[PDB]
Amino acid sequence: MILLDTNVISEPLRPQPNERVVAWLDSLILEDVYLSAITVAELRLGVALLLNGKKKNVLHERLEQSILPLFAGRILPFDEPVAAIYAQIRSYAKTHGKEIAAADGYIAATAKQHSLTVATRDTGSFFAADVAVFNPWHL
């Protein structure tokens, strides 16, 4: 099962997206792909900060009415159980000279709690969190 990090779901939306990432996303079974509520918040914030009004309005519509519905029932919250895993992962990394930022920590804890592999371009923090990861920029 996969938990898509913000940098992966955002790649296809770029002017010249990496074809390898797009193809990988196309090989996945939708029902097996999840999003953390944290990633949804970051996606929504990114859209709301666009400098081009026209683009923002259109992308807001597409995000809410076309993209997020693909994940209905699979937007995972950061709740009490995930909070426990978060503290465990971040403290362990810290007491072992590893680096994990809060944001990455939230995603990593969500994935561990649900037994998911994190898809992300930046695998560093997740390796330290001892959570499975996959970088779609690679084969």
């Binding site: 913000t6 779901i9 955002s10 296809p12 939306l13 770029r14 002017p15 010249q16 997206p17 990432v21 797009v22 193809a23 990988w24 996303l25 196309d26 996945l28 939708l30 792909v33 970051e42 996606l43 990114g46 859209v47 666009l50 683009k55 259109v58 992308l59 597409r62 076309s66 993209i67 693909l70």
Partner: peptide, 19 residues
Amino acid sequence: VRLGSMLASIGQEIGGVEL
């Protein structure tokens, strides 16, 4: 079905964005 293609299509109609 094809998640990547679905998203790439959105990016193209708006001209692309950096999220």
